[PDB]
Design a protein around this motif. Structure first.
Motif, mmCIF file in Angstrom:
data_model
loop_
_atom_site.group_PDB
_atom_site.id
_atom_site.type_symbol
_atom_site.label_atom_id
_atom_site.label_comp_id
_atom_site.label_asym_id
_atom_site.label_seq_id
_atom_site.Cartn_x
_atom_site.Cartn_y
_atom_site.Cartn_z
ATOM 1 N N UNK A 164 0.827 -1.201 0.000
ATOM 2 C CA UNK A 164 0.000 0.000 0.000
ATOM 3 C C UNK A 164 0.862 1.253 0.000
ATOM 4 N N UNK A 165 1.967 1.237 0.745
ATOM 5 C CA UNK A 165 2.868 2.383 0.729
ATOM 6 C C UNK A 165 3.382 2.608 -0.678
ATOM 7 N N UNK A 166 3.789 1.536 -1.348
ATOM 8 C CA UNK A 166 4.252 1.678 -2.716
ATOM 9 C C UNK A 166 3.189 2.255 -3.629
ATOM 10 N N UNK A 167 1.962 1.751 -3.518
ATOM 11 C CA UNK A 167 0.877 2.248 -4.354
ATOM 12 C C UNK A 167 0.671 3.740 -4.147
ATOM 13 N N UNK A 168 0.506 4.157 -2.892
ATOM 14 C CA UNK A 168 0.220 5.561 -2.629
ATOM 15 C C UNK A 168 1.391 6.445 -3.031
ATOM 16 N N UNK A 169 2.621 6.003 -2.777
ATOM 17 C CA UNK A 169 3.767 6.825 -3.138
ATOM 18 C C UNK A 169 3.880 6.979 -4.650
ATOM 19 N N UNK A 170 3.640 5.906 -5.401
ATOM 20 C CA UNK A 170 3.698 6.017 -6.851
ATOM 21 C C UNK A 170 2.630 6.941 -7.404
ATOM 22 N N UNK A 171 1.389 6.767 -6.943
ATOM 23 C CA UNK A 171 0.343 7.656 -7.429
ATOM 24 C C UNK A 171 0.648 9.087 -7.020
ATOM 25 N N UNK A 173 3.688 10.550 -6.608
ATOM 26 C CA UNK A 173 4.759 11.137 -7.410
ATOM 27 C C UNK A 173 4.255 11.476 -8.806
ATOM 28 N N UNK A 174 3.511 10.564 -9.429
ATOM 29 C CA UNK A 174 2.991 10.888 -10.754
ATOM 30 C C UNK A 174 1.965 12.013 -10.687
ATOM 31 N N UNK B 13 2.799 -0.507 -9.713
ATOM 32 C CA UNK B 13 1.365 -0.688 -9.894
ATOM 33 C C UNK B 13 0.616 0.630 -9.743
ATOM 34 N N UNK B 14 0.988 1.448 -8.758
ATOM 35 C CA UNK B 14 0.317 2.727 -8.607
ATOM 36 C C UNK B 14 0.530 3.630 -9.805
ATOM 37 N N UNK B 15 1.780 3.742 -10.254
ATOM 38 C CA UNK B 15 2.044 4.587 -11.410
ATOM 39 C C UNK B 15 1.314 4.043 -12.627
ATOM 40 N N UNK B 95 7.498 -2.730 -17.256
ATOM 41 C CA UNK B 95 7.247 -2.684 -18.690
ATOM 42 C C UNK B 95 5.960 -1.933 -18.991
ATOM 43 N N UNK B 96 4.961 -2.050 -18.117
ATOM 44 C CA UNK B 96 3.723 -1.323 -18.329
ATOM 45 C C UNK B 96 3.912 0.173 -18.216
ATOM 46 N N UNK B 97 4.762 0.610 -17.289
ATOM 47 C CA UNK B 97 5.057 2.033 -17.182
ATOM 48 C C UNK B 97 5.724 2.525 -18.454
#
Lengths: 531, 375
Positions: A164-171, A173-174, B13-15, B95-97
């Protein structure tokens, strides 16, 4: 989140069958609940003798340790293998203490449920006399042995939450990248952006703060400083860094989305000015959620801390109270933003209300210091700290008077400016000296090998402290000037820009200061909060 | 898995989720292009059906690990270097990114100094370079193993036939549209089915798989069931060849198209029914004689809920019919304009079919020994 599950994690695999059946004990009460007078008294007494057998094992360990320890000292006097011997004993010491104290929490909750079944006062007093004063608490030899060994030798998170940390951090940053692109490319409109970037600054000053407490707990935990005992939390449960990172990323997403919506032009039915209200309302609701979900334990603890701090005079001061009071002292920009939002939305500083809301957190901290002095009844360093925090009120009020005179045109503006710069110098130097001396403990007389540092050090590279010192020197000067400008003394147009670009630096200063304040509190005892 | 790789999966996955949202929004709003471009940047399909394949392979490995079936012994990997599902999800997300960023850049109008036709080339070159990276990092062991297995597969008749060889041969049997899109990229970048390339390059995976099966038969000398498998894979040859002949015949327009279509549809129905029967009986082992309590299932089952089987069986029945029509239509018999959308909306479903087939094939292969690959 019952303790039965928690202890199941810390139960020794070898001694699994040696633990008491607390979990099974709970069940039988419900069945017997879901002629009256005489049948009930006797069967209650069977819960006492069961603990005797377990109590035997801890007692005999005291004798074994002395006999075992003494013999191996002589042979050693007359490398890796030697140290491995003591690892097993040290680990076993901790969990024995865990078993003792945490066993208290179990029976107490269940005992009172059946106490009201008969509506009698005899049961309540039965446990008070024959439990609290039991001799089990008279054992103190455990601590004596721990310290002896060191003196002689030296002198001579769950996968899902990480995902979940990875998901939220990625969203996040983008989302930041998209927000920057939109701001730089699709904002040719000229509608006074500032009343937007001001209201939305009160999201960043908190998102940065939580993202920083993340790294702060990281450093606290994996650096040899315990952050749980001093913060008087429950040792059973603790919020690792990952939890703070995810909670901060969530609000970061819910801030970036609201900002983006304010930027782009969604369906015209939704006015542009409602998104900030929705965001802040949701944040407040999330803080004040009365349900049992979304980390209700931590939210409730924080709410209780806020209640205690904001009415400090009437409540005893712990460490958490002081820490949050100081953090609010630094995060006065959030209060300024909230007051500005309220005034703006009610209308579309007259009576100096901006000054009052700017100085409120300093008021909390100063009154808390005074209460601490009254409780402890010792002058130093409590009145010194009180004066340091009172310098903030003096600064803000004197700046406000200077600005008012400048507007009026009174000839005393020059003298007001002179005394105001004098106040700036004194307060900056005083707070800096205080921060470097007591809040961190640096510049002590007894530090020869470490030069201008503490006698004992915790963080690996002294370069950390050496850089942080100069950082604090050059940044604490920014705090006072930032507050003075946010008091909108003159501020024609270029004051809000400097305030906005400086507030995040202030939060960063608090990040470093937190590092070193808790390091010092653990190493020494600067504030008499323990023992 | 280690905490760091789980965090990386979270990041990618988030990106990916947000990039997909941005892509949908950009297509729906900021596509002010009425020129016929859509069916020329519909070559990113060839990367989409690889990204989705990698995601579903990750789910496949997770399902195998959790349900109990050991995928490591069968795939003859060294047990000390297993690839848990987190790694697959992470690499697929990466790869999806890259794919999403390429498509986005193509949609928008960045600095004109660079053309708009270079992005797909850059993305595919990056993919190949990453696959063939000669360094010792970025899963060098697994990448090297995959490369060696690919070399073995593409030259199946010469080398020994192991489980991984056959499995990837079947995988490439399903993912024919990637090869078709590679051929399309080559042809378009050359000009920017005259030689009938759209059929041979579209059926080549069938050739690989069929010759591999024949080699196994020759080295083992037992018809049951290798010869039957060869027949099943040659039905694809006949289907594609007859579809191409029908295309040319209709273009010429002589008076035999009615009979040609009659025989083509007969061939389609027979091939699809027979391949479905094979997949259910020989490949999966379902419909065993000795199963009273399990009804139409194996005497031993591994996956807990039987509803999963009861649904997947009908799903395979209804989707295998889609694959054959999809391949025939991608063979563009006439298909003036109503084919390049149906092929695209069907191919991801084909990969989903191959995903479920992987689930159950590996389960059955562990349980029984339908493949004479052990002992």
């Amino acid at each position: 989140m019952k303790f039965a599950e928690h202890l199941s994690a810390h139960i020794t695999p070898e001694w699994r069958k040696q633990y008491i059946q607390y979990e099974a004990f709970k069940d039988m009460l419900y069945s017997a609940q879901d002629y009256f007078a005489k049948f009930e008294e006797k069967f209650f007494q069977t819960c006492e003798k069961e603990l005797a057998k377990i109590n035997t094992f801890y007692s005999e360990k005291l004798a074994e340790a002395q006999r075992r320890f003494a013999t191996l000292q002589n042979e050693l006097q007359s490398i890796k293998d030697l140290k491995l011997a003591f690892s097993e004993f040290y680990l076993s010491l901790i969990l024995l203490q865990n078993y003792q104290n945490l066993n208290f929490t179990g029976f107490r909750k269940i005992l009172k449920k059946h106490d009201k079944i008969l509506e009698t006062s005899r049961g309540a007093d039965w446990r008070v006399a024959h439990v609290e004063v039991a001799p089990f608490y008279t054992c103190k030899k455990i601590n004596q042995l721990i310290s002896e060994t060191e003196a002689v030798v030296t002198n001579e998170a769950p996968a899902w939450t990480t995902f979940r940390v990875g998901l939220f951090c990625g969203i996040f940053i983008v989302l930041n990248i998209t927000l920057v692109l939109a701001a730089v490319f699709k904002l040719e409109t000229d509608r006074s952006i500032w009343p937007l970037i001001r209201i939305y600054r009160g999201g960043f000053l908190l998102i940065e703060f939580l993202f920083l407490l993340g790294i702060n707990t990281y450093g606290w935990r994996q650096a040899g400083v315990n952050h749980v005992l001093i913060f008087e939390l429950n040792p059973r449960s603790n919020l690792s860094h990952q939890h703070l990172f995810e909670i901060a990323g969530f609000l970061g997403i819910l801030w970036c989305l609201s900002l983006l919506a304010c930027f782009f032009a969604p369906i015209s039915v939704i006015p542009t000015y409602v998104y900030p209200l929705a965001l802040y309302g949701f944040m407040v609701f999330f803080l004040i959620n009365p349900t049992k979900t979304f980390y209700y334990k931590s939210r409730f603890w924080l709410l209780k801390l806020l209640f205690r701090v904001f009415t400090a005079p009437f409540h005893k001061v712990g460490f958490a109270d002081f820490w949050l009071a100081d953090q609010l002292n630094s995060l006065s920009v959030i209060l300024m933003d909230l007051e500005y939002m309220i005034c703006f939305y009610s209308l579309e500083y007259t009576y100096g209300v901006r000054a009052i809301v700017q100085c409120i957190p300093a008021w909390l901290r100063f009154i808390q210091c005074l209460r601490r002095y009254r409780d402890t009844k010792r002058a130093f360093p409590h009145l010194v700290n009180a004066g340091k925090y009172s310098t903030t009120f003096f600064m803000v009020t004197f700046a406000a008077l200077y600005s008012t005179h400048k507007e009026r045109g009174h000839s005393d503006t020059m003298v007001f400016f002179y005394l105001w710069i004098v106040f700036y110098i004194i307060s900056s130097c005083y707070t800096l000296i205080w921060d470097l001396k007591m809040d961190w403990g640096l510049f002590d007389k007894n530090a020869g090998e470490n030069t201008f540092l503490r006698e004992e050090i915790v963080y690996p590279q002294k370069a950390y402290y050496y850089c942080a010192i100069i950082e604090d020197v050059i940044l604490r000067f920014a705090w006072t000037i930032q507050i003075s400008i946010t008091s909108t003394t003159l501020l024609p147009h270029s004051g809000d820009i400097i305030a906005t670009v400086f507030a995040p630096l202030e939060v960063f200063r608090r990040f470093v200061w937190n590092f070193f304040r808790l390091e010092n509190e653990h190493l020494n005892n600067c504030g008499e909060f323990r023992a």
